Each structure stands twice: as structure tokens, then as C-alpha cells.
Amino acid sequence: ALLSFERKYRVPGGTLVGGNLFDFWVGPFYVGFFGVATFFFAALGIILIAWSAVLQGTWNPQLISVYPPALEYGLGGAPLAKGGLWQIITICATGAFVSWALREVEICRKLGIGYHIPFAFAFAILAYLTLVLFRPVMMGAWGYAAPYGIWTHLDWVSNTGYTYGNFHYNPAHMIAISFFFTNALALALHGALVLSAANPEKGKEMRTPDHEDTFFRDLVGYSIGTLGIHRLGLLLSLSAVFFSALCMIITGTIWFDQWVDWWQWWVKLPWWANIPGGING
Amino acid sequence: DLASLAIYSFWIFLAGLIYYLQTENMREGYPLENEDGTPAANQGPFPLPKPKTFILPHGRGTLTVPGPESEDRPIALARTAVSEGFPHAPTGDPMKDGVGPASWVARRDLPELDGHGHNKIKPMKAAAGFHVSAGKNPIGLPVRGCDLEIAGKVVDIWVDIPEQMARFLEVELKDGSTRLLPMQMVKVQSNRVHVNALSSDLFAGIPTIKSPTEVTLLEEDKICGYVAGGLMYAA
Amino acid sequence: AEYQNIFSQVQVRGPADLGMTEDVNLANRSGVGPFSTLLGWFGNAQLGPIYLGSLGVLSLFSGLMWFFTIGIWFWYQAGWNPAVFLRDLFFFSLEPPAPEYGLSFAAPLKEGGLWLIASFFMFVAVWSWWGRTYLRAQALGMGKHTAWAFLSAIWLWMVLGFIRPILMGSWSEAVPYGIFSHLDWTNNFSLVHGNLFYNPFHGLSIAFLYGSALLFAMHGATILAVSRFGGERELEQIADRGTAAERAALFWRWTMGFNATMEGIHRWAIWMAVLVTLTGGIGILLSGTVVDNWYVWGQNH
Numbered sequence: 001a002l003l004s005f006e007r008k009y010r011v012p013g014g015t016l017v018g019g020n021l022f023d024f025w026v027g028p029f030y031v032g033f034f035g036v037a038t039f040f041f042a043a044l045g046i047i048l049i050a051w052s053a054v055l056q057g058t059w060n061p062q063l064i065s066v067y068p069p070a071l072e073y074g075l076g077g078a079p080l081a082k083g084g085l086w087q088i089i090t091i092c093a094t095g096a097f098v099s100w101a102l103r104e105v106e107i108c109r110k111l112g113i114g115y116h117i118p119f120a121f122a123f124a125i126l127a128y129l130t131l132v133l134f135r136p137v138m139m140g141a142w143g144y145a146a147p148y149g150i151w152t153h154l155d156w157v158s159n160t161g162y163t164y165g166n167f168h169y170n171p172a173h174m175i176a177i178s179f180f181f182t183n184a185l186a187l188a189l190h191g192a193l194v195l196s197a198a199n200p201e202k203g204k205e206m207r208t209p210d211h212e213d214t215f216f217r218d219l220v221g222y223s224i225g226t227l228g229i230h231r232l233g234l235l236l237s238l239s240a241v242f243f244s245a246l247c248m249i250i251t252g253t254i255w256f257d258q259w260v261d262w263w264q265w266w267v268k269l270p271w272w273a274n275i276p277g278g279i280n281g
Numbered sequence: 282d283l284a285s286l287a288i289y290s291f292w293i294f295l296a297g298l299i300y301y302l303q304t305e306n307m308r309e310g311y312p313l314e315n316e317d318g319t320p321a322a323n324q325g326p327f328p329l330p331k332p333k334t335f336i337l338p339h340g341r342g343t344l345t346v347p348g349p350e351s352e353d354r355p356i357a358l359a360r361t362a363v364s365e366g367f368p369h370a371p372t373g374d375p376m377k378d379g380v381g382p383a384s385w386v387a388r389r390d391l392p393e394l395d396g397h398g399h400n401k402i403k404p405m406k407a408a409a410g411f412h413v414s415a416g417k418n419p420i421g422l423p424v425r426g427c428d429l430e431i432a433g434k435v436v437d438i439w440v441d442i443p444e445q446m447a448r449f450l451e452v453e454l455k456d457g458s459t460r461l462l463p464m465q466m467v468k469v470q471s472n473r474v475h476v477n478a479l480s481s482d483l484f485a486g487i488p489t490i491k492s493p494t495e496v497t498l499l500e501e502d503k504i505c506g507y508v509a510g511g512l513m514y515a516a
Numbered sequence: 517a518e519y520q521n522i523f524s525q526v527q528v529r530g531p532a533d534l535g536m537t538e539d540v541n542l543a544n545r546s547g548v549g550p551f552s553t554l555l556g557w558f559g560n561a562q563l564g565p566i567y568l569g570s571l572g573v574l575s576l577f578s579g580l581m582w583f584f585t586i587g588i589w590f591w592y593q594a595g596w597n598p599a600v601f602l603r604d605l606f607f608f609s610l611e612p613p614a615p616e617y618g619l620s621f622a623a624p625l626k627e628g629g630l631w632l633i634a635s636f637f638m639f640v641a642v643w644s645w646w647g648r649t650y651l652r653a654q655a656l657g658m659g660k661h662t663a664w665a666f667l668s669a670i671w672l673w674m675v676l677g678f679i680r681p682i683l684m685g686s687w688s689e690a691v692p693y694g695i696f697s698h699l700d701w702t703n704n705f706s707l708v709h710g711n712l713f714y715n716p717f718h719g720l721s722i723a724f725l726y727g728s729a730l731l732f733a734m735h736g737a738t739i740l741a742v743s744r745f746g747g748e749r750e751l752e753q754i755a756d757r758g759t760a761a762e763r764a765a766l767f768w769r770w771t772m773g774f775n776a777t778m779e780g781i782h783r784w785a786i787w788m789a790v791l792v793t794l795t796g797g798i799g800i801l802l803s804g805t806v807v808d809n810w811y812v813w814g815q816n817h
């Protein structure tokens with residue numbers, strides 16, 4: 001139940017709430033007040049979902065699905081069976097995630113590390129809350145929100161995109177995708193670089209960071225360096241999620257026409273709007 | 282149907298891969314242990330992988346993992362409860378004893394080397410061609426701890442030669458000796474360097490290094506350990 | 517404010533670093549470029565040197581040829597008018613031969629010929645760059661991880677521009693060169709195959725793409741959180757585990773019940789990423805060659 005080096009770190013302290021009340025582990029897991037909050041929110045929420053399963057009439061996870069109130073309840077409540085189950089499950093999910101984050105903070109304090117991980121997590125939570133809370137509210141109804149099921153939440157992505165034509169043309173969505181692809185490029189490179197240094201040609205000695213710099217300078221004439229690359233991955237990946245939330249919060253709110261048409265501001269600029277030739281004249 | 286073969290084959294591959302990866306990540310810390318150091322009954326469902334050997338450069342040796350594991354240090358902690366899974370209370374001063382968020386590991390007592398074979402980290406004074414190139418130069422600033430008392434003054438930056446970055450500030454105390462602070466644990470301001478982890482009176486207890494122009498991995502771990510431990514143990 | 521280590525507080529510079537030598541032919545390295553104080557808040561300040569041997573020059577030149585071949589066409593499309601070229605830059609497109617010309621090289625320059633030319637240049641640019649990936653590692657005696665990985669990206673690219681067009685019997689299947697048009701082609705590809713959300717490879721591919729952001733967020737943040745113990749010195753933490761690597765592992769173990777090593781996390785990393793384009797290229801390759809409609813295929817399988 002402990003890693004060979006673990007015991008020295010398992011000391012009292014760190015907790016944000018409760019003093020020593022929940023200062024302990026179960027097997028590998030740290031608990032804390034927020035471990036308790038998480039179990040409760042998640043347990044309730046799974047229960048509500050398994051309940052919401054029977055009222056719809058399956059035990060198949062490929063079919064189990066839970067919808068927001070319909071479009072006409074606005075931002076009010078709803079019979080459990082017609083979207084209150086969803087509202088509460090959402091409250092549960094939020095409580096679970098925020099709890100998980102705050103528990104992550106408690107683990108940080110006990111371990112004397114920095115808060116970067118739960119801070120990073122908090123971006124993911126904010127993306128979620130954009131789909132299910134902030135966007136709906138700004139838009140006047142729960143019913144715009146994503147629903148909960150494996151294949152039905154895809155349906156929503158698709159219906160939502162196609163409401164604005166080809167969603168490709170959402171320009172914040174473009175920036176977002178760019179960060180996604182770039183982050184994966186950087187993850188492949190990072191993983192491969194470190195591994196190539198630690199696992200060199202058979203029989204040779206472990207290489208060094210200087211080898212890692214050299215390989216990259218050789219290859220593309222620049223190397224961001226070992227502090228830099230971890231800064232980079234973090235930035236790329238939080239930026240992807242930042243723009244993801246952005247691209248959706250502006251959609252159905254400040255812009256609600258076909259995204260392709262947004263690009264007309266560019267082509268319609270005075271100094272060139274009327275010159276003939278090309279694609280738009 | 283081909284697409285069906287491919288997808289089914291893929292799930293099998295992916296299960297193989299997760300297995301391989303999980304066992305690769307068992308090359309340290311394993312086998313699991315009871316709170317008293319003996320092998321735990323339950324090791325989980327993944328076996329330890331077959332050992333591999335890293336050839337260290339500059340005749341520094343090899344490393345074989347997994348291998349017989351060992352703290353190579355006394356750990357000043359005691360149980361606070363009669364069964365598995367509770368906190369272990371420091372038996373003395375946890376900053377001095379190096380436990381909790383003040384832990385350090387018994388890394389090799391040599392300094393890290395660059396690919397050329399020279400010490401990775403040097404004070405800048407001894408580093409040929411190295412100077413502050415941007416940002417406020419901290420050398421000369423008073424150093425202030427979390428008690429808002431001045432604990433000393435910055436007398437150099439220790440820099441990483443191959444990666445060209447600042448790694449520690451070297452600080453001089455009232456008594457004329459110096460200590461390293463990790464660069465990541467200070468805030469350089471226009472008229473001071475502030476250190477939120479330590480109060481002024483804890484500076485003297487920063488672990489000292491034995492040479493003034495090099496630091497060993499073991500000495501780095503004790504310094505970083507000790508300073509990080511102040512976040513919990515100072516207030 | 518506690519300090520976070522996302523931007524350096526003090527930069528420090530010394531003699532340009534010219535690199536390790538190992539078996540590299542030094543005659544082919546440039547000299548150092550300048551130093552960017554800008555970059556150096558975040559990463560290294562030093563630009564270059566770069567290594568440009570023969571394969572390097574080959575790659576770089578075809579690469580530019582591919583690029584200029586598209587750009588000449590774009591200018592042509594714009595009737596040589598600077599203002600129109602800029603106005604319409606995302607709209608121009610260099611399209612492949614129509615279905616009628618099959619896999620042949622017959623089509624007129626202005627209706628596919630140029631496309632084939634640019635593509636030819638793209639092919640040599642990339643494959644030569646691949647080899648440069650392998651050769652630059654060899655000269656330093658390093659593992660071939662980078663080239664193996666790049667191979668996975670090359671896989672999706674080959675499938676889109678070459679393999680799947682060939683298996684389908686025409687070049688008209690391939691992706692056009694243009695900003696807006698390649699997006700249109702993507703949307704259209706999905707509609708015509710009954711919606712890629714029904715391609716199980718497509719959804720694996722997304723799991724990994726999302727997963728790479730999750731993982732790199734986890735890892736990046738983890739390393740910066742233990743950078744106050746020298747965490748980012750990963751090769752030495754692999755060779756001689758420090759308290760950085762221990763606090764890192766234990767953060768995750770306490771959070772989610774298992775953890776990595778300082779070496780292993782990089783294996784999780786390279787694979788999370790590489791599997792994006794692996795599964796991806798498989799999904800695309802199967803589309804229209806074996807499965808005409810993902811929805812349909814989903815209903816049987």
C-alpha cells in the first residue's frame with residue numbers, strides 16, 4: 001500500500017477544511033474533506049443517473065441518456081423526468097469536479113509543491129461549465145445545454161455545429177484547433193526527445209540535455225529547452241481549452257448566423273471590396 | 282468485414298500497450314510496501330518488468346531498474362494510529378530531519394555534469410562569459426523572509442551552463458556564510474528579493490554545501506527540500 | 517503573488533553554445549543565429565546553429581517549391597493584383613485533377629497538372645525531412661523515437677494525399693491546397709461517408725487528441741510544480757530519482773491511485789500523441805475503400 005519512498009511524505013497537514021478530521025488515506029488514495037465531498041457528489045450523481053436510466057427504460061450505457069429541460073422551461077426547474085434529473089446531476093458534476101480540484105490543492109500543500117495541476121484542471125472545469133451553465137444562461141435556457149450520454153452528446157455537437165453551417169468557420173474554433181494540433185505535435189516531440197536521450201543506440205551511454213538541445217538545433221535551428229517545453233505543453237493545452245470555451249460562448253449569443261458569413265467583414269473592406277478578379281469579384 | 286477486424290484488433294493492441302506502459306512505470310517505487318517497510322501482500326495485477334540498464338556517461342556507472350530499493354537514510358517519523366493509512370508525525374523538527382514537505386532523497390553526492398563532463402551548475406562569478414542578459418539583476422539586493430525581516434543579501438546567481446538559466450540565488454547571512462535558495466522560490470522585486478517559504482530565522486538552517494563553486498545532487502535535494510518545507514513548517 | 521515559473525524573472529547569457537559533436541559532420545552546421553530576449557522569457561534565447569547537409573537542402577528546396585507552386589497559382593487566380601490576392605487569400609485553392617483523369621498524369625496544368633506538381637514537391641520535402649529526422653539522431657547516437665513518431669503523422673498525410681486516392685482510383689479524392697477549401701473538403705468528406713462521428717477510429721482519434729491535451733496539461737503542470745526541486749532535469753531524475761520525481765509520482769498516486777515514473781510518463785506521452793494520427797489514418801483509409809457509410813456500418817457492426 002506504499003511506494004518504496006512514500007512514507008516520509010505522509011505527514012499531517014495541508015488540509016483546507018476540517019483540520020485533521022479527514023487527514024488520511026485509503027490504500028493509495030488521499031481523502032481529505034474534499035475527498036469526502038467528491039464521493040458524496042459523485043455517488044449521488046451516479047445514483048441519479050441510474051435512476052434517470054429506469055424512467056427512460058434501459059440498463060445500456062450506449063443508450064442511457066439524460067436531457068436538459070426542454071427549451072420552454074427557460075432557466076427554471078422541471079419535473080425530474082423531463083429535465084430536473086439533469087439539472088441536479090449537473091449540480092452534482094460541478095460539485096464533484098470543483099471538489100476534486102480543491103482536493104488536489106490539499107495534496108499540493110501536503111507535498112510542498114506548486115498549485116499548477118489543479119489550476120490547469122480548472123480550465124477543463126470552466127470549459128464544461130461553459131457548455132452546461134454559462135452558455136445556456138446567456139442564451140435563456142437549460143435546453144441549449146449538452147445532454148449526458150455517450151452517443152447523444154455527439155448528436156448535440158453535430159446539431160449545434162450545423163446550426164451555424166460549417167462550424168469550421170468559427171474563427172475562435174480555428175485558433176482552438178490550432179492549439180490542439182500543436183499540443184499533440186509538441187507532446188510527440190517531447191516524449192520522443194527524452195526517450196531518445198534516455199534510450200540511445202544499443203550499447204551507448206545515456207545522452208544529456210545538451211544532446212537534446214543539439215538534436216533540435218540541428219533539426220530546425222532552435223531548441224526551446226527543458227524548462228521551456230513543459231511551459232509550452234502547459235500553455236498550448238490550456239490555450240486550446242481557453243479558445244474552445246471562447247469559441248462556444250460567443251456562439252448563439254454575439255454571433256448566431258452562419259459562421260462562413262462572418263468572414264465577409266474582411267472581403268468587404270473599402271480599399272478592395274470592389275476591385276474585380278479573384279474569387280469575390 | 283475489414284473495418285471490424287481492424288477495430289477489434291485495435292482494442293487488443295491498446296490493452297497490450299496499457300499493460301506494457303503500466304509495467305514500464307513500475308521501474309521505481311516497487312514492490313509496494315507496508316508502512317513498516319516490508320513487502321505488502323497485495324502488489325496489484327501488473328508484474329514488475331524485466332530490469333533494464335542505463336549506462337551513465339563520464340564513468341559515473343550504470344543503473345538497473347527495477348532493483349532492490351532503499352531510502353539510504355533514517356526517517357524521523359512515527360505512527361499516529363493503530364492501523365494502516367493515517368499520517369505519520371515527525372518525531373523531531375521536520376525541517377532539520379527532512380520529512381514531510383521538507384523531504385530530500387539520497388541522490389548521488391556528486392554534482393550533475395554537462396555533456397562535456399563539466400559541472401552543470403556554477404556560480405556566475407566562476408562562469409566564463411555569463412552575465413545577466415535581461416530582467417532585474419538580483420545581485421546585491423537584500424533578501425526578505427516571510428516574517429518581513431531581512432535575512433541576508435544576494436551575492437551571486439548560480440547558473441546552469443548548458444541550459445543558460447538561473448538555478449539558485451546565493452545569499453549571504455549576518456554571520457558571513459552563504460546559502461543557496463532555489464530560483465523558483467524567490468520573487469525578485471525592484472528593491473528586494475522576497476522569500477515567502479522561510480522566515481528570517483530559518484535561513485541559517487538551510488543545508489550548506491561543502492564546496493563554494495559546485496553543488497552535488499544530494500545537496501540540491503536538501504536545499505530544495507528544506508526551502509519547500511517552509512511553506513508548511515514556518516508559520 | 518507567490519512565483520509560478522511560467523516566465524523567467526532573470527535571464528542569463530553566456531557564450532553561444534555550439535552543441536555536442538559526437539558523429540556530426542561539423543562542416544554542415546551554420547553558425548549561431550542571434551539571441552532573442554523575447555523567446556528567453558519563456559524558453560532558450562539562442563537561435564541556431566542549424567544543420568543543413570544535402571538531404572537538408574533537398575527537403576528545404578522542394579518544400580519551398582511546393583509552397584511557391586501553390587502561390588503562383590494563387591496569384592494567377594487573383595489576376596496578378598496585389599490587393600485581390602490579399603483580399604481573397606483564404607479563398608484561393610489549388611485543386612486536384614477531376615475524377616475523369618483517374619490516377620493518370622494527363623490533366624492540363626490549369627486543371628490538376630499544377631496540383632500534381634506541388635504534391636510531387638510536397639512528397640519529396642516531407643520524406644526527405646523524415647530521413648533528416650533519423651540521420652540527425654544517428655549522428656548523435658540517440659534513439660530513433662522522433663523519427664518513429666513523425667512516421668505516425670506522415671501516415672495520416674500519406675493516406676489523405678496518396679494512399680487513399682490511389683486505392684479509390686483517382687487523384688480527385690485528395691485534399692486541395694487552400695485555407696478555406698481544405699476545410700470544405702473536410703466537412704464534405706464526413707457528409708459523404710455518413711458522418712465521421714460513426715467511424716470508431718475517428719472517435720479514438722478524438723479520445724487521443726483530447727487525451728494529449730489532458731496529458732500534456734498534467735505533465736507540464738506537474739513538472740513546473742516540482743521545478744522548485746529541479747524537476748525539469750528529467751534525464752538526471754531518471755538516472756538518479758530525486759525528491760522532485762517522488763513528489764510528482766505521489767501527487768498522482770494520492771489523487772487517482774496510480775502514477776508514473778520520470779521515464780515512463782514520456783512513454784505515456786509519446787503514445788497518447790502518436791495514436792491520434794495512427795487511428796486517424798486508419799479511419800480515413802477505410803473510408804470509401806471498405807466502408808461507404810459509417811452510420812450504416814454502425815448498424816451492422
Ligand code: BCL
Pocket residue numbers: 168173174175177178179181182185673676691695696698699702
Ligand atoms: C485533419 C483534417 C483536415 C484538416 C482540418 C483542419 C481543421 C478543421 C482546421 C485546420 C487548420 C489548419 N490546418 Mg488543416 N487539416 C488537414 C491537414 C492539414 C495539412 C496537411 C499537410 O495535411 C496542413 C499543412 C494543414 C494546415 C492547417 C493550417 C492552415 C491550420 C493550422 C494547422 C496546425 O496548427 O498544425 C500544426 C501547427 C504548427 C504550428 C506547425 C506548422 C506551422 C504552420 C502554421 C502550418 C501552415 C502551413 C500553410 C502552408 C501556411 C498558410 C499560408 C498562407 C500565406 C497563410 N492541415 C486535414 C485534411 N485543419 C485550422 C485552421 O485554422 O484552418 C484555417 C482548423 O480549424
Ligand code: BCL
Pocket residue numbers: 097124125126127128130131156157158159160161162166167168173176177180241243244245246247248702
Ligand atoms: C459537426 C461538428 C462541428 C464542430 C462543432 C463543435 C461544437 C458544437 C463544439 C466543438 C468544440 C470543439 N471542436 Mg469543433 N466541430 C467541428 C470540427 C472540428 C474539428 C475537425 C478536424 O473537423 C476539430 C479538430 C474540432 C475541435 C474542436 C475543439 C476546439 C473543441 C472540443 C474540445 C473541448 O472543448 O474540450 C474542453 C473539454 C471539456 C469540455 C471536458 C471537461 C472535462 C470535465 C472538467 C471533467 C470530466 C470528468 C469525467 C466525468 C470523467 C470522470 C470518470 C473518470 C474517467 C474515472 N472541431 C465540426 C465542423 N466543435 C466544442 C467546444 O469548443 O467546447 C467548449 C463544442 O462545444
Ligand code: BCL
Pocket residue numbers: 046128131146150151153154157718719720722723724726727730
Ligand atoms: C469536448 C467537446 C464535446 C465533446 C465531443 C466529443 C467528441 C466529438 C467525441 C467525444 C468522445 C468522448 N467524450 Mg465527449 N465531448 C464533450 C464533453 C464531454 C464530457 C464532459 C463531462 O464534459 C465527458 C466526460 C466526455 C466524455 C467523452 C468520452 C465518452 C469520449 C472520450 C473522451 C476522451 O477520451 O477524452 C480525453 C480523456 C481521457 C483519455 C481520460 C479518460 C476519460 C474517460 C474515457 C471518460 C469516460 C466517461 C464515462 C463514459 C461517462 C461518465 C462516467 C461515470 C458516469 C462517472 N465528453 C463536449 C460536449 N466527446 C469521443 C467518443 O468516442 O465518443 C463516443 C468523440 O469522438
Ligand code: BCL
Pocket residue numbers: 157181184641642669670672673676701702703705706711712713717718721722725792793795796797799800
Ligand atoms: C465536419 C467535419 C467532421 C470531421 C471530419 C474529419 C476528417 C475528414 C478528418 C478528421 C480528422 C480528425 N478530426 Mg474530425 N471532424 C469532425 C469533428 C471533429 C471534432 C469535434 C469536436 O466535433 C473533433 C474534436 C475532431 C477531431 C479530429 C482529429 C482528432 C482528427 C485529425 C487529427 C490530427 O491531428 O490531424 C492533424 C495532423 C495531420 C493532418 C498530419 C499532418 C502531417 C504532415 C506530414 C505535416 C506536413 C506539414 C507540411 C510540410 C507543411 C509544413 C509547413 C511548416 C511551417 C514547415 N473532429 C466532423 C464530424 N475529422 C482526421 C482523421 O484522422 O479522421 C479519422 C481527418 O482526416
Ligand SMILES: CC[C@H]1c2cc3[nH]c4c(c3C)C(=O)[C@H](C(=O)OC)c4c3nc(cc4[nH]c(cc(n2)[C@@H]1C)c(C(C)=O)c4C)[C@@H](C)[C@@H]3CCC(=O)OC/C=C(\C)CCC[C@@H](C)CCC[C@@H](C)CCCC(C)C
Pocket residue numbers: 038041042045046089092093094096097100104117118120121122123124147148149150151153237238241726727729730733734737771772
Ligand atoms: C484543461 C486542459 C485539458 C484537461 C486538463 C486536466 N484534466 C484533469 C486535470 C487536468 C489538469 C486533473 O488534474 C484531473 C485528473 O485527476 O486527471 C487524472 C483531470 C481530469 N480530467 C478528466 C477527464 C477529461 N478531461 C478532458 C479534457 C481536458 N482536461 C482538457 C483537454 C476531457 C475531455 C477532453 O473530454 C475529459 C473526459 C478526468 C480523468 C479527471 C477529473 C476526474 C474527476 O473530476 O473526478 C471527480 C468526479 C468523478 C469521479 C465522477 C463524477 C461523475 C458524476 C458527477 C456524474 C457524471 C457526470 C456527467 C458529466 C457524465 C457525462 C457523460 C459524457 C458521455 C458526456
Ligand SMILES: CC[C@H]1c2cc3[nH]c4c(c3C)C(=O)[C@H](C(=O)OC)c4c3nc(cc4[nH]c(cc(n2)[C@@H]1C)c(C(C)=O)c4C)[C@@H](C)[C@@H]3CCC(=O)OC/C=C(\C)CCC[C@@H](C)CCC[C@@H](C)CCCC(C)C
Pocket residue numbers: 181182184185188189219220575576579580583641642643645646649662663665666667668669789790791792793
Ligand atoms: C503524431 C501527431 C502529431 C505530429 C507529429 C510530428 N510532426 C512532426 C514530427 C512529429 C513527431 C517531426 O519530427 C517533424 C518535425 O521536424 O517537427 C519539428 C514534424 C513536422 N510536422 C510539421 C507540421 C505539421 N504537423 C502536424 C501534426 C502532427 N504532427 C500531429 C498532431 C500538422 C497539422 C496538425 O496539421 C502540421 C501542419 C512540420 C513542422 C514538420 C515536418 C516538416 C517538413 O516535412 O517540412 C518540409 C520542409 C519545408 C516545407 C520547407 C518549406 C517552408 C514553406 C512552407 C514556407 C514557410 C511559410 C511561412 C510561415 C514562413 C515564411 C516563408 C518565406 C520564405 C516566404
Ligand SMILES: COC(C)(C)C(=O)C/C=C(\C)CC/C=C(\C)CC/C=C(\C)CCCC/C(C)=C/CC[C@H](C)CC/C=C(\C)CCC=C(C)C
Pocket residue numbers: 583584586587588590632635636638639673674675676677678691692693694695698
Ligand atoms: C507572397 O507570394 C509568394 C509568391 C511569395 C508565395 O509563395 C505565397 C504562397 C502562398 C500564398 C502559398 C499558400 C499555401 C497554402 C495555403 C497551402 C495550404 C495547404 C494545406 C492546408 C494542406 C492540407 C492537406 C494537404 C495534404 C493532405 C497533402 C498530401 C500530399 C500527398 C501526401 C502527396 C502525394 C503526391 C502526389 C499525389 C504526386 C505523386 C507522384 C509520383 C510520381 C510519386
Ligand SMILES: CCCCCCCCCCCC[N+](C)(C)[O-]
Pocket residue numbers: 299303324325326327773774775
Ligand atoms: C487511459 C488509461 C488509464 C490507465 C489505467 C491503468 C490503471 C493502472 C492501475 C495499476 C496501478 C496500481 N498499482 C499501483 C498497485 O500498481
Ligand SMILES: CCCCCCCCCCCC[N+](C)(C)[O-]
Pocket residue numbers: 220221222546547548549550563564565566
Ligand atoms: C550564420 C547565420 C546562420 C543563422 C541560422 C539561424 C536559423 C534560424 C531558424 C529558426 C527557425 C526555427 N523555428 C521556426 C522552428 O523556430
Ligand SMILES: CCCCCCCCCCCC[N+](C)(C)[O-]
Pocket residue numbers: 715716717719720723727784787788
Ligand atoms: C495511451 C493512453 C490510453 C487512453 C485511451 C482512452 C480511450 C477512450 C475510449 C473512447 C471510445 C472510442 N470508441 C471508438 C469506441 O467510440
Ligand SMILES: CCCCCCCCCCCC[N+](C)(C)[O-]
Pocket residue numbers: 027028324325326772773774
Ligand atoms: C478509464 C478509467 C479507469 C480508472 C482507473 C483507476 C484505477 C486506479 C486503481 C488504483 C488502486 C489499485 N489497487 C486496487 C491495487 O489498489
Ligand SMILES: [Fe+3]
Pocket residue numbers: 190194230735739750782
Ligand atoms: Fe517531461
